[PDB]
């Protein structure tokens, strides 16, 4: 029972046990979010199909690892989905061919947020999988661990919705103009979204975010956001309605705002965050 | 040239500050008791008095100085004293220039000479004054008199 | 010559100058005549001798015989019985008030109790081509009040856009004469001498440099010298004489000398009585922080920090800067700042090398605490170099370089609420430079600029400015070039333009009655070396009689840069009347078309009533002349008395003399003054009455006869009806101003006698001066 | 230390009054100022009234002397008229001699709208060289105040040539040849040196 | 926070509007008596340059004076009066010769700022002659 993969692969250490570096492409699916589809990554073949048959199953205790070690979901083993982390043993897969066939495993995740996301950088642990290999020849059985590693910076969804981008930087003109903020939100299922702003604010109305600029900031100047034609204050939930499959822009626009008295000349910068909440 | 500040001023020609010095006689019947020296008895310890022309203007280059006052009945070139009971008798003050020469009292403007001054820097005119006896002898008394210094500019 | 010793009722003289006459006792001592006078401390102090100059005279008794010949070095006395006088020779180093232009403290007028109000309502309306209109209106309101020696002020304004009262300043200042300083209560600001300028609201006791005579303000070489006998000291500079005064034998000190660094070096010569000369030269160079030998400038402040920002706090603090002048051109300084989250100490030390140029280098240590409760220690040192006008015409005005450490923060940096103004990119090193070069006779080259570096980023603040001015006779050829590049932006903003000013004043007769002599043309062409190029021709000048209305007309064209072109046009009027000012301007830029409008003025509320005029400026002189109408004030453009006869002088210098003169040619034919010229000595923020007694009525010349003989010379004459009076001259003539058509006249010359009476014809009203003849009674 | 505002006063025909500053710089010395106007013969003919004619100055004071006209257009109006202003200062309080200070200046009564300009009068001066004397002729209606009359190297006496008239001066034959002269303007300054044109 | 947006801005200072483009100062009449000594100076005459309607973002204004000067260092007299120069200062006691610059704060309430200055006549060599006084000072504003 020898395996391989095309992209990155890892190094075997301590016998038949190793990690694995694979590509990630998490997409928001209805019900549960897909994390990694190993059925397109890892390929295994049997070097002696006409003398012996190798069987491989996934034991219990197989869960996620690292920053995802607190999440749950399901796992598609040979076409059938099972609760993840696995609480019991799974059916075995026959491996009696010199032709490298895929290992039908796809880890999924149970949505707990609205449209949140966790970033996975290249080299961080993803999951801890426990495999078990047997054969039809003798009764030799042994267990081993396959850990999952990512080789590309990728963010994994948490809710039933996602965005076009999670880190966008827009540039205002030379005062006192304004620029539109390109942010669209799509959903795999019709949900009642509702986003609110959060961060450092200036005025008592919590509508003007402070000028958190770096080199020689301005004074008496803040940043205020608006949609259509209405001020969007901090910690105030803005409703969208029924977001479908089509991307719906928030319609936000960045503006300058006067915080205090004298207006000192200089650059302006304000980092504003947004969080989604189901209504 | 966003803004412009234009200055306009004019300097006016100034005359001269004339400070007079009041002359005080002392003598104390020295010559008066002894001389008795004709009508030309102009022998008296001269008291140097000055007319301060300071400060002045930059135009003041030349002036005509001259004295005017009450002359004596005997000698016309003598300034008569006050005709009082407490005053003396037979005396007339003589006025001398810096070169110790008799200055024509009550002289017209066509007789005076041009005393050239120093434009700018302060000027000073030094004169002398002594007593000349007209009558004889000289009786003891007060020595008061009055005169007038006329400064005729060019 | 000489007479037997004893008590002498003799006039006392000091360096051939009369003072007082007392009974002087003479004892046998060591002198020429073998006798010495016996004077006391109380007499010498009232004679001219400064007792504070002689260390050890305050220990002597009230009427003890002061051994002047021994205790005081280089001092001689002499009695002369030949002319009844007492000649003394005291060195001028032991005299006070030697400053030329010195003004006694008791002459200073505290002012009059009166209210204050200064309005300046301006604003403009802009008509955009595409967009609409824009109206703006900003009204000023500088309220105030004076109470004897207290000056209250309150600044506030109103605004309007296309809408409430905003507060500005409110302080209560007072000058403390015994301390020679000023006490400020309320809103104020500190000096940027040692520490940076700080706006606050509390108490400040700082020395005023305006109180000192103008011949003592600023740094200047205090020349110390010792003369054997009576000598005459003269001082020349740049070929011309600048100082000249004779001095008594002994040591002397010259603490006058008008500050003129760029005039060259001093040339002192002490020619003795015989002919011996003491030739020595003292070089001249001055740094703005240097203090004259003996001068001591201090500034103790205490209050809360008030900036005006919503992102800043209001911490409590203390600041006490101190500067002192030492001999040999040395100057020590350095204050200390104490606060809640910050403290700093400074040490000055600066000397005038003269031949090598003056130099002062101070260092300021700062123990700051940023809003994130993170302490930071650091020091900051600055250099200040200056050189006089060289022989080649090299005038190095200032060479400055300040260097701060990475942990050095100003007090203003610890007054914010949030971290990320910035406290991670503080300033590192600044380089200032300002040098002028005179190119021959009719040319001068100007140079300036700055260079700032910051900790962290490799970005640099760059400012630069160079201008060459050539003066061809009447025409002033101006050519300048600036360069401003900030760190937090891209691209260098530099402008290149020249200006040609051609006045019409020296194109006509100097006595021309045309108003074209009060005008001048100004053409200028600009180009920022980046596509854009402008050119502007304009003619401005004044109008009216007193030259109050100032006009200006300039039209031109601009284009390039970013693809924006269009013709221009500007017109401005600025009038200053005796009841207030007014300014209206109009701008035309094809695309932009706005309209300026503003009316300012000053209002005074004194005891006599209310007086209108031009906007006030700290110190204001109130003219009081009940009777005059259109009275022009000399040396004052646009200042006319109101209908009541009162007026206000917006322009007035403090702690000096101000000549308030009324032009008598503008007086009414029925009004005359006793004295048309008076002097006033106001303190800073004072309001001084400039009174002028006016006489309303007919001016007449009477011939008073008594017993077929005219009244004698010097006979006093007073009017029974009016208060007016006069003196009888020769031939019994007497001039009287503001007389009634008919009234009793009182005359008194000896011990009243003559009593006159008259009745001039009503037809003699259109005459400026009628002559008559009357008699008396007894 | 009494001082006048200017060294000369011009009176335009038609004006009502002209100013003149009398300034005393002595803080303690009190003076009694007297003033009047004499004619071309030095006699007060009452053609000009001075106000105030008598007043006191206690200490460092100042005053504006206004001079009124008393002619009512009865003087020659083709040329200027010569008058003399006299300001007498009397020291106000031992066998002493107290002096009086009369500051004496000229007084030109200039008619209204004259022909030849003032500045064009200094160059119209003609001469007449004969024997040991020199005659200065002034056809202009202006009182030419001639000074620094240098006949080559020799310096001659000062002279005041009346309008439409003449005045002679002393001239030694032991002098130079080329005649140069400078005049006093209406401000007290000196006009540029010129060349003598006799006959 | 699901999505963090950084908004970068930039505030630049724009030119105001000059209200005083040709302020004129008349010294009146001076005497050679007063400026006879070396170092003698005339009385001060307060002059101010008013700049109104300053655009938002401009809090400081720097003015750069310029003109012709003589050997003394001060501004040269173009008039007929010799041995006399002109001095320019501010309301703090600082000489502003041909070149030196001065920066003032702008009143945010009225959107305007001015330059409290002062002008007098003086002579270094002494002995000021009779004549006219003609002086024109050029100055360019630099907003920041």
Q: What is the DSSP string of C103-140?
A: --GGG-B----EEEEEEEEB-EEEEESSS-EEE-EEEE
Q: Please report the sign of the dihedral spanned by the C-alpha atoms of residue B23, residue B28, residue B34, residue B36.
A: positive
Q: Residue written as tokens 């170092």?
A: E39
DSSP code string of chain B: --EEEEEEEEEEPP-EEEE---EE----SSHHHH----S-B--S----EEEEEEEE-SS--EEEEEEEE-B-SS-TTSEEB---SSB-BSEEEEEE-TTS-B--TT--TTT--EEE--SSS-EEEEEEEEEEESSSSPBP-B--EEEEEEEEE-
CA C606/CA C647 separation, integer angstroms: 11
The C-alpha torsion from A258 through A261 and A264 to A268, rounded to 10°, is -30
Q: C126, C134 in Cβ contact below 8 A?
A: yes
Determine the distance from the C-alpha atom of residue C593 to the mean position of all C-alpha atoms in its chain, rounded to a whole number.
41
Number of domains in chain B: 1
Asked if D196 and D142 sit in the same domain, the reply is yes
- The phi-psi region of residue A39 (left if phi > 0; otherwise alpha if psi is between -120 and 50; otherwise beta) is alpha
| Of the candidates D71, C615, E32, the residue with the CA atom closest to the CA atom of residue B15 | E32
CA C385/CA C286 separation, integer angstroms: 9
Pull the structure tokens for residue D87. 């300001």
CA C198/CA D117 separation, integer angstroms: 63
| Of the candidates C534, C595, C544, the residue with the CA atom closest to the CA atom of residue C570 | C595
Q: C747, C704 in Cβ contact below 8 A?
A: yes
| Of the candidates C542, C534, C470, C531, the residue with the CA atom closest to the CA atom of residue C504 | C542
CA C697/CA C679 separation, integer angstroms: 27
CA C74/CA C249 separation, integer angstroms: 7
Contacts of C457 in chain A (CB under 8 A): 215
For A225, other C-beta atoms within 10 Å of its C-beta total 26
How do B62-69 and B114-116 pair as beta strands? antiparallel
- Element (H or E) spanning C70, and its range? helix C68-71
HEC letters along C26-68: EEECCCCCCEEEECCHHHHCCCCCCCCCCCCCCCCCCCCCCCH
Asked if A21 and A87 sit in the same domain, the reply is yes
Q: Which residues lie closer than 8 Å to E70 by C-beta, 6 or more apart?
A: E76, E77, E85
Determine the distance from the C-alpha atom of residue C705 to the mean position of all C-alpha atoms in its chain, rounded to a whole number.
55
For residue A35, report the phi and psi dihedrals to the nearest 5 degrees. Answer: -105, -70
Provide the CATH number for the domain around residue D22: 2.60.40.10
Residue A220 touches partner C, C-beta closer than 8 Å = yes
Whether the domain at C607-697 and the domain at C698-778 fall into the same CATH topology: yes
CA B36/CA B51 separation, integer angstroms: 32
Q: C-alpha angle C163/C616/B10, rounded to 5°?
A: 135
CA C109/CA C102 separation, integer angstroms: 15
Query: Across-strand partners of E52?
Result: E17
CA B72/CA A1 separation, integer angstroms: 158
CA B109/CA B153 separation, integer angstroms: 11
Query: Which experiment gave this structure?
Result: X-ray
Residue B56 touches partner E, C-beta closer than 8 Å = yes
> Which CATH topology does C1-96 take?
Ubiquitin-like (UB roll) (3.10.20)
CA A238/CA A249 separation, integer angstroms: 13
Q: Which residues lie closer than 8 Å to C318 by C-beta, 6 or more apart?
A: C301, C302, C337, C338, C339
Q: Give the residue numbers spanning the domain of D52.
A: 2-112
Contact state of A216 with C309 under an 8 Å Cβ cutoff: no
For C750, other C-beta atoms within 10 Å of its C-beta total 8
Q: Which residues lie closer than 8 Å to C9 by C-beta, 6 or more apart?
A: C21, C22, C23
For C167, other C-beta atoms within 10 Å of its C-beta total 11
CA E117/CA E121 separation, integer angstroms: 14
Q: C522, C538 in Cβ contact below 8 A?
A: yes
For C485, other C-beta atoms within 10 Å of its C-beta total 16
Number of domains in chain A: 2
For residue E105, report the phi and psi dihedrals to the nearest 5 degrees. Answer: -75, 155
Residue E130 touches partner D, C-beta closer than 8 Å = yes
Q: C540, C551 in Cβ contact below 8 A?
A: yes
| Of the candidates C512, C569, C511, C580, the residue with the CA atom closest to the CA atom of residue C537 | C569
For C212, other C-beta atoms within 10 Å of its C-beta total 19
CA C298/CA C365 separation, integer angstroms: 20
Asked if D99 and D22 sit in the same domain, the reply is yes
Residue among B1, B2, B4, B9 with most chain E CBs within 10 A, to mutate:
B9
> Which CATH topology does C698-778 take?
Immunoglobulin-like (2.60.40)
CA D63/CA A132 separation, integer angstroms: 124
Choose one of D92, D112, D132: the last residue of a domain: D112
To the nearest whole Å, the CA of D7 is away from the closest chain B CA by: 5
Q: Which of residues 227-256 of C touch B (CB under 8 A)?
A: none
For residue C576, report the phi and psi dihedrals to the nearest 5 degrees. Answer: -125, 100
Determine the distance from the C-alpha atom of residue C493 to the mean position of all C-alpha atoms in its chain, rounded to a whole number.
37
Contact state of E130 with D3 under an 8 Å Cβ cutoff: no
> Do you find a cis peptide bond into A85, omega within 30 degrees of 0?
yes
CA B60/CA D105 separation, integer angstroms: 12
Residue B4 touches partner E, C-beta closer than 8 Å = yes
Q: E62, E56 in Cβ contact below 8 A?
A: no
- Element (H or E) spanning E42, and its range? none
CA distances from E12 to C488, C489, C570, E131 (A): 10, 9, 25, 49
Residue E29 touches partner D, C-beta closer than 8 Å = no
For A166, other C-beta atoms within 10 Å of its C-beta total 17
For residue C332, report the phi and psi dihedrals to the nearest 5 degrees. Answer: -100, 150
Q: B7, E44 in Cβ contact below 8 A?
A: no
Residue A261 touches partner E, C-beta closer than 8 Å = yes
Contacts of D91 in chain B (CB under 8 A): 20, 22
Chain C touching partners, 3 or more CB pairs below 8 A: A, B, D, E
Asked if A47 and A121 sit in the same domain, the reply is yes
Asked if D14 and D41 sit in the same domain, the reply is yes
Asked if A4 and A118 sit in the same domain, the reply is yes
Q: Is residue C178 packed enough to be buried (19+ CB in 10 Å), middle (13-18) or exposed (0-12)?
A: exposed
Residue E56 DSSP SS3: coil
Listed in order, strand segments (DSSP E) in C473-616 are 475-485, 493-503, 519-527, 533-542, 550-559, 566-567, 569-576, 581-589, 592-596, 599-605, 610-613
Determine the distance from the C-alpha atom of residue C691 to the mean position of all C-alpha atoms in its chain, rounded to a whole number.
23
Residue among E28, E37, E82, E130 with most chain D CBs within 10 A, to mutate:
E130
CA E11/CA A258 separation, integer angstroms: 12
Pull the structure tokens for residue A8. 């990155």
CA C15/CA C385 separation, integer angstroms: 44
CA B78/CA B70 separation, integer angstroms: 8
| Of the candidates D184, D180, D177, D175, the residue with the CA atom closest to the CA atom of residue D194 | D180
Determine the distance from the C-alpha atom of residue B1 to the mean position of all C-alpha atoms in its chain, rounded to a whole number.
60
CA distances from A212 to A216, C312, C380, C532 (A): 10, 14, 27, 35
Residue C412 DSSP SS3: helix
> Do you find a cis peptide bond into B36, omega within 30 degrees of 0?
yes
Residue C69 DSSP SS3: helix
Q: Give the residue numbers spanning the domain of E47.
A: 1-144
Residue among E130, E131, E134, E138 with most chain B CBs within 10 A, to mutate:
E130
Residue A254 touches partner E, C-beta closer than 8 Å = yes
For A245, other C-beta atoms within 10 Å of its C-beta total 9
Contacts 24+ apart (CB under 8 A), C444-453: C444/C468, C444/C469, C444/E68, C444/E69, C444/E98, C445/C469, C446/C480, C446/E66, C446/E98, C446/E99, C447/E99, C448/E99, C448/E100, C448/E101, C449/C483, C452/C427, C452/C428, C452/C487, C453/C427, C453/C428, C453/C429
Q: Which residues lie closer than 8 Å to D107 by C-beta, 6 or more apart?
A: D8, D9, D11, D37, D48, D82, D83, D84, D85
Number of domains in chain D: 2
Report, in angstroms and rounded to the nearest whole number, the Rg of chain C calculated over CA atoms: 34
Asked if A42 and A169 sit in the same domain, the reply is no
Q: How many helices (H) and strands (E) does chain A have?
A: 0, 26
> Do you find a cis peptide bond into D52, omega within 30 degrees of 0?
yes
Asked if A70 and A187 sit in the same domain, the reply is no
Q: C233, C249 in Cβ contact below 8 A?
A: no
| Of the candidates A203, A202, A191, A198, the residue with the CA atom closest to the CA atom of residue A248 | A191
Pull the structure tokens for residue D195. 């060349």
CA C265/CA C356 separation, integer angstroms: 12
Provide the CATH number for the domain around residue B114: 2.60.40.1090
Pull the structure tokens for residue C14. 């000091």
Q: Give the residue numbers spanning the domain of A235.
A: 158-279
Provide the CATH number for the domain around residue A59: 2.60.40.1090
CA B82/CA B146 separation, integer angstroms: 8
How do C427-438 and C443-454 pair as beta strands? antiparallel
| Of the candidates C647, C659, C642, C604, the residue with the CA atom closest to the CA atom of residue C623 | C647
How much of chain A is in helix, strand and coil states, percent to nearest 5? 0, 45, 50
Residue C348 touches partner D, C-beta closer than 8 Å = no
| Of the candidates C311, C284, C270, C335, the residue with the CA atom closest to the CA atom of residue C413 | C311
| Of the candidates D132, D108, D134, the residue with the CA atom closest to the CA atom of residue D121 | D108
Asked if D30 and D91 sit in the same domain, the reply is yes
For C654, other C-beta atoms within 10 Å of its C-beta total 19
Chain B touching partners, 3 or more CB pairs below 8 A: C, D, E
Asked if A128 and A192 sit in the same domain, the reply is no
Choose one of D91, D112, D133: the last residue of a domain: D112
Pull the structure tokens for residue C587. 């701008």
Q: C255, C245 in Cβ contact below 8 A?
A: no
For C131, other C-beta atoms within 10 Å of its C-beta total 8
CA C497/CA E128 separation, integer angstroms: 36
Cross-sheet strand order for the sheet of A161-163: A161-163, A184-187, A248-249
Cross-sheet strand order for the sheet of A194-198: A169-171, E3-11, A266-276, A194-198, A237-239
For C314, other C-beta atoms within 10 Å of its C-beta total 12
Q: Which stretches within E24-74 are classed as H helix?
A: none
- Element (H or E) spanning C74, and its range? none
CA C275/CA D50 separation, integer angstroms: 52
Pull the structure tokens for residue A222. 């803040």
Contact state of E38 with C510 under an 8 Å Cβ cutoff: no
CA C386/CA C398 separation, integer angstroms: 5
How do C493-503 and C519-527 pair as beta strands? antiparallel
Query: Across-strand partners of E94?
Result: none
| Of the candidates C646, C679, C644, C674, the residue with the CA atom closest to the CA atom of residue C661 | C679
DSSP 8-state assignment for residue C71 = H
What per-residue string of b and e applies to C358-380 under the rule 16 or more CB within 10 Å gives b? Answer: bbbbbebbbbbbbeeeeebebbb
For D77, other C-beta atoms within 10 Å of its C-beta total 16
Choose one of D44, D77, D112: the last residue of a domain: D112
| Of the candidates A164, A166, A158, the residue with the CA atom closest to the CA atom of residue A277 | A158
For residue D118, report the phi and psi dihedrals to the nearest 5 degrees. Answer: -60, -45
Q: C484, C463 in Cβ contact below 8 A?
A: yes
CA D4/CA D102 separation, integer angstroms: 11
Q: C556, C534 in Cβ contact below 8 A?
A: yes
| Of the candidates C580, C609, C615, C611, the residue with the CA atom closest to the CA atom of residue C118 | C615
How do C533-542 and C519-527 pair as beta strands? antiparallel
Q: Which residues lie closer than 8 Å to A211 by C-beta, 6 or more apart?
A: A217, A218, A219, A221, A222, A223, A259, A268, A269, A270, E9
Provide the CATH number for the domain around residue E4: 2.60.40.1090
Cα within 13 Å of Cα(C731), Cβ side:
10
Resolution of the experimentally solved model in angstroms: 3.8
CA A10/CA C310 separation, integer angstroms: 57
DSSP code string of A211-255: ---SSSB-BSEEEEEEETTEE--BT-EEE---B-SS-EE--EEEE
DSSP 8-state assignment for residue C490 = -
CA A75/CA A37 separation, integer angstroms: 10
> Which CATH topology does C217-282 take?
Immunoglobulin-like (2.60.40)
Pull the structure tokens for residue C16. 């051939």
Pull the structure tokens for residue C492. 């260098």
Contacts of C677 in chain D (CB under 8 A): 21, 62-64
CA C73/CA C459 separation, integer angstroms: 65
What are the residues of chain E with a beta carbon less than 8 Å away from any beta carbon of chain A?
Answer: 1-13, 56-59, 108, 144
> 2.60.120.640, 3.40.1360.10, 1.20.910.10, 2.60.40.2610: which CATH number matches C607-697?
2.60.40.2610
For residue C105, report the phi and psi dihedrals to the nearest 5 degrees. Answer: -60, -30
């Amino acid at each position: 029972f020898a395996c391989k993969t095309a992209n990155g692969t890892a190094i075997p250490i301590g016998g038949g046990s190793a990690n694995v570096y694979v590509n990630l492409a998490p997409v928001v699916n209805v019900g549960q979010n897909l994390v990694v589809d190993l059925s397109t990554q890892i390929f295994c073949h049997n070097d002696y199909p006409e003398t012996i048959t190798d069987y491989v199953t996934l034991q219990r205790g197989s869960a996620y690892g690292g920053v995802l070690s607190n999440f749950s979901g399901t796992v598609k083993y040979s076409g059938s989905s099972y609760p993840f982390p696995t609480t019991s043993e799974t059916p075995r897969v026959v491996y009696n061919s010199r032709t490298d066939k895929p290992w039908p495993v796809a880890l999924y995740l149970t949505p707990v947020s609205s449209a949140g996301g966790v970033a996975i950088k290249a080299g961080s642990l993803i999951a801890v999988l426990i495999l078990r290999q047997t054969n039809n020849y003798n009764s030799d059985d042994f267990q081993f661990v396959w850990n999952i590693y990512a080789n590309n910076d990728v963010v994994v969804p948490t809710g039933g919705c996602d965005v076009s981008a999670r880190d966008v930087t827009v540039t205002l003109p030379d005062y006192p103009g304004s620029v539109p903020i390109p942010l669209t939100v799509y959903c795999a299922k019709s949900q009642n979204l509702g986003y609110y702003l959060s961060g450092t604010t200036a005025d008592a109305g919590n509508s003007i975010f402070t000028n958190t600029a770096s080199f020689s900031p301005a004074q008496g100047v803040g940043v205020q956001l608006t949609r259509n034609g209405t001020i969007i204050p901090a910690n105030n939930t803005v409703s969208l309605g029924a977001v479908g499959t089509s991307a719906v822009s928030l319609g936000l626009t960045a503006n300058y705002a006067r915080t205090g008295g004298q207006v000192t000349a200089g650059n302006v910068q304000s980092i504003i965050g947004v969080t989604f909440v189901y209504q | 040239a966003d803004s412009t500040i234009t200055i306009r001023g004019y300097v006016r020609d100034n005359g001269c500050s004339v400070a007079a010095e009041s002359t005080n006689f002392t003598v104390d019947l020295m010559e008066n008791a002894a001389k008795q020296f004709n009508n030309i008895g102009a022998t008296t310890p001269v008291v140097p008095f000055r007319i301060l022309l300071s400060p002045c203007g930059n135009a003041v280059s030349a002036v005509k100085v001259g004295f005017t006052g009450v002359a004596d009945s005997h000698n016309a070139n003598l300034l008569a004293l006050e005709n009082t009971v407490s005053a003396a008798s037979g005396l007339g003050i003589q006025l001398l220039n810096e070169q110790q020469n008799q200055i024509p009292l009550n002289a017209p403007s066509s007789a005076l000479s041009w005393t050239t001054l120093t434009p700018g820097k302060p000027n000073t005119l030094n004169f002398y004054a002594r007593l000349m006896a007209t009558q004889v002898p000289v009786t003891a008394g007060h020595i008061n008199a009055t005169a007038t210094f006329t400064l005729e500019y060019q | 010559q000489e007479l037997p010793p004893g008590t002498y009722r003799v006039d006392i003289y000091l360096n051939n100058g009369y003072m007082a006459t007392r009974d002087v006792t003479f004892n046998t001592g060591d002198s020429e005549q073998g006798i010495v006078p016996c004077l006391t401390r109380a007499q010498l102090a009232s004679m001219g001798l400064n007792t504070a100059s002689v260390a050890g005279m305050n220990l002597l008794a009230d009427d003890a015989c002061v051994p002047l010949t021994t205790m005081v070095q280089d001092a001689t006395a002499h009695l002369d019985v030949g002319q009844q006088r007492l000649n003394l020779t005291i060195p001028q180093a032991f005299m006070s008030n030697r400053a030329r232009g010195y003004i006694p403290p008791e002459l200073w007028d505290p002012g009059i109790n009166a209210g204050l109000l200064n309005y300046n309502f301006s604003g403009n309306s802009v008509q955009n081509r595409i967009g609409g209109n824009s109206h703006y209106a900003y009204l000023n309101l500088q309220s105030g009040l004076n109470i004897g020696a207290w000056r209250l002020r309150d600044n506030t304004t109103w605004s309007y856009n296309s809408n409430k009262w905003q507060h500005i300043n409110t302080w209560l200042e007072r000058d403390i004469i015994p301390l020679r300083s000023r006490l400020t209560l309320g809103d104020g600001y500190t000096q940027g001498d040692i520490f940076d300028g700080i706006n606050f609201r509390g108490a400040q006791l700082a020395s005023d440099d305006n109180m000192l005579p103008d011949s003592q303000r600023g740094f200047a070489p205090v020349i110390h010298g010792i003369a054997r006998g009576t000598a005459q000291v003269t001082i020349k500079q740049n070929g011309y004489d600048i100082y000249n005064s004779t001095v008594p034998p002994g040591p002397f000190t010259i603490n006058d000398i008008y500050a003129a660094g760029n005039s060259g070096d001093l040339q002192v010569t002490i020619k003795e009585a015989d002919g011996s000369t003491q030739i020595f030269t003292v070089p001249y160079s001055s740094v703005p922080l240097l203090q004259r030998e003996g001068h001591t400038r201090y500034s103790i402040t205490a209050g809360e920090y008030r900036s005006g920002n919503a992102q800043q706090e209001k911490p409590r603090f203390f600041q006490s800067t101190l500067l002192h002048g030492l001999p040999a051109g040395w100057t020590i300084y350095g204050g200390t700042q104490l606060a809640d989250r910050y403290r700093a100490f400074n040490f000055g030390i600066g000397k005038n090398m003269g031949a090598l140029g003056a130099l002062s280098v101070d260092m300021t240590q700062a123990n700051s605490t940023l809003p994130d409760d993170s302490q930071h220690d650091g020091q900051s040192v600055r250099f200040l170099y200056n050189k006089s006008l060289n022989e080649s015409g090299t005038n190095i005005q200032l060479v400055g370089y300040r260097y701060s450490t990475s942990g050095y923060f100003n007090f203003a940096d610890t007054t914010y609420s949030r971290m990320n103004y910035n406290l991670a990119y503080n300033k590192r090193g600044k380089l200032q430079l300002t040098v002028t070069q005179q190119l021959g006779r009719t040319s001068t080259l100007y140079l300036s600029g700055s260079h700032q570096t910051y900790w962290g980023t490799s970005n640099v603040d760059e400012q630069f400015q160079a201008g060459l001015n050539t003066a061809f006779e009447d025409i002033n050829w101006t050519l300048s070039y600036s360069l401003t590049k900030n760190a937090w932006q891209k691209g260098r903003d530099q402008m290149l333009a020249l200006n040609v000013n051609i006045p019409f004043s020296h194109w006509l007769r100097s006595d021309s009655k045309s108003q074209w002599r009060h005008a001048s043309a100004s053409y200028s062409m600009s180009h920022d070396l980046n596509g854009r190029m402008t050119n502007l021709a304009g003619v401005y000048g004044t109008l009216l009689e007193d030259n109050n209305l100032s006009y200006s007309v300039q039209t031109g064209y601009a284009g390039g840069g970013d693809g924006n072109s269009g013709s221009t046009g500007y017109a401005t009027l600025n009038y200053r009347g005796g009841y207030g000012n007014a300014n209206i301007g109009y701008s035309h830029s094809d695309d932009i078309k706005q309209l300026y409008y503003g009316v300012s003025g000053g209002v005074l509320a004194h005891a006599n009533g209310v007086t209108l005029g031009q906007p006030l400026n700290d110190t204001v002189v109130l003219v009081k002349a009940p009777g005059a109408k259109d009275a022009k004030v000399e040396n004052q453009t646009g200042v006319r008395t109101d209908w009541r006869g009162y007026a206000v002088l917006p322009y007035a210098t403090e702690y000096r003399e101000n000549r308030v003169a009324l032009d008598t040619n503008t007086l009414a034919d029925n009004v005359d003054l006793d004295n048309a010229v008076a002097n006033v000595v106001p303190t800073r923020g004072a309001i001084v009455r400039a009174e002028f007694k006016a006489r309303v009525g007919i001016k007449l010349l009477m011939t008073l006869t008594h017993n077929n003989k005219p009244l004698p010379f010097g006979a006093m004459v007073t009017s029974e009806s009016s208060q007016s009076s006069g003196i009888v001259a020769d031939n019994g003539q007497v001039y009287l101003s503001g007389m009634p058509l008919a009234g009793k006249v009182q005359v008194k010359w000896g011990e009243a006698h003559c009593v006159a009476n008259y009745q001039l014809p009503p037809e003699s009203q259109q005459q400026l001066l009628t002559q008559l003849s009357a008699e008396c009674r007894s | 230390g009494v001082a006048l505002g200017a060294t000369r006063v011009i009176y335009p025909a038609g004006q009502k009054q002209e100013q003149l500053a009398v300034t005393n710089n002595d803080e303690n010395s009190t003076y009694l100022i007297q003033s009047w106007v004499e004619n071309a013969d030095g006699v007060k003919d009452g053609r000009f009234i001075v106000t105030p004619p008598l007043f006191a100055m206690k200490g460092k004071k100042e005053n504006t002397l206004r001079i009124l006209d008393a002619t009512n257009n009865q003087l020659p109006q083709d040329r200027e008229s010569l008058f003399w202003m006299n300001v007498k200062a009397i020291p106000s309080m031992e066998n002493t001699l107290q002096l009086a200070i009369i500051s004496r200046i000229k007084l030109y009564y200039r008619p209204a709208k004259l022909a030849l300009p003032p500045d064009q009068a200094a160059e119209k001066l003609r001469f007449r060289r004969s024997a040991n004397s020199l005659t200065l002729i002034n056809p202009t209606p202006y009182y030419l105040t001639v000074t620094e009359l240098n006949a080559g190297t020799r310096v001659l006496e000062n002279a005041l040539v009346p309008p439409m008239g003449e005045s002679t001066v002393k001239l030694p034959s032991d002098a130079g040849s080329n005649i140069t002269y400078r005049t006093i303007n209406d401000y007290g300054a000196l006009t540029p040196k010129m060349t003598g044109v006799m006959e | 926070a699901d999505v963090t947006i950084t908004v970068n801005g930039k505030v630049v200072a724009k030119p105001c509007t000059v209200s005083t483009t040709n302020a004129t100062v008349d010294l009146g009449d001076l005497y050679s008596f007063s400026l006879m000594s070396a170092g003698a100076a005339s009385a001060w005459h307060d002059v101010a340059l008013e700049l109104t309607n300053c655009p938002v973002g401009t809090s400081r204004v720097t003015a750069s004076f310029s003109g012709a000067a003589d050997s003394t260092g001060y501004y040269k007299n173009q008039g007929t009066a010799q041995n006399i120069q002109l001095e320019l200062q501010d309301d703090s006691g600082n000489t502003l010769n041909t070149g030196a610059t001065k920066t003032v704060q702008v009143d945010d309430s009225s959107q305007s700022a001015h330059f409290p200055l002062q002008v007098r006549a003086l002579t270094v060599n002494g002995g000021a002659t009779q004549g006219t006084i003609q002086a024109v000072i050029s100055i360019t504003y630099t907003y920041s």
